[PDB]
Amino acid sequence: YAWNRKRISNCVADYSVIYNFAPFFAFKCYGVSPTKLNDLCFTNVYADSFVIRGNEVSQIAPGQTGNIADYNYKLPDDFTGCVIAWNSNKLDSKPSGNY
Amino acid sequence: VIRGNEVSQIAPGQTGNIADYNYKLPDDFTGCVIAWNSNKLDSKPSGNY
Amino acid sequence: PTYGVGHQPYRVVVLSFELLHAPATVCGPKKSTNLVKNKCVNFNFNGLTG
């Protein structure tokens, strides 16, 4: 409900160093392909960061409704970006409960 | 044996590092790709080098 | 073993099938049937159905 947003601008972007920072599986890119991200140039790139449950990762797609995509974080239907999600059970969970 | 991020590179038409310098598949490829996790046999606590 | 699921090792086996241009040598467990001629019949020649 309070997702951050970082402006990435006035820099050269290497998208092959993304895989060395987080242990995800693959990109989920809409409009583009993740292997052609180094051969083309943008104007502004935004990065939104939040933590959700594994049931609700499918609601981070354009055209989806539900609980996250209704009152928490809604994507436009003309989305031209990539969604990266990975599991984190060793940093976001506690035996007493992370609240 | 590859890493988990690089399983998506074993496909016709993909690029990256494995696809460009280690193992390239043709664009007219026909066949099957079989991948499974091997964390219990191909890993070591000190580093499988 | 302490790395995440994206940095864990994976074993990959790729099978590439060479289609019918040469005489076929890798063929499945289906049995054969005696040949019939001059009769309307469904045939199956090495996977070619007609």
Swiss-Prot record, chain A:
Disulfide bonds join 29-82. Residues 53-55 are annotated as: Integrin-binding motif. Changing residue 94 to T: In strain: Omicron/BQ.1.1. It comes from the Viruses. Binds to host ACE2. RBD also interacts with the N-linked glycan on 'Asn-90' of ACE2. Cleavage of S generates a polybasic C-terminal sequence on S1 that binds to host Neuropilin-1 (NRP1) and Neuropilin-2 (NRP2) receptors. Interacts with host integrin alpha-5/beta-1 (ITGA5:ITGB1) and with ACE2 in complex with integrin alpha-5/beta-1 (ITGA5:ITGB1). May interact via cytoplasmic c-terminus with M protein. May interact (via N-terminus) with host bilirubin and biliverdin, thereby preventing antibody binding to the SARS-CoV-2 spike NTD via an allosteric mechanism. Attaches the virion to the cell membrane by interacting with host receptor, initiating the infection. The major receptor is host ACE2. When S2/S2' has been cleaved, binding to the receptor triggers direct fusion at the cell membrane. When S2/S2' has not been cleaved, binding to the receptor results in internalization of the virus by endocytosis using host TFRC and GRM2 and leading to fusion of the virion membrane with the host endosomal membrane. Alternatively, may use NRP1/NRP2 and integrin as entry receptors. This is Spike protein S1. The lineage of its organism: Viruses, Riboviria, Orthornavirae, Pisuviricota, Pisoniviricetes. The gene is S. The chain holds residues 351 to 449 of 1273 of the full protein.
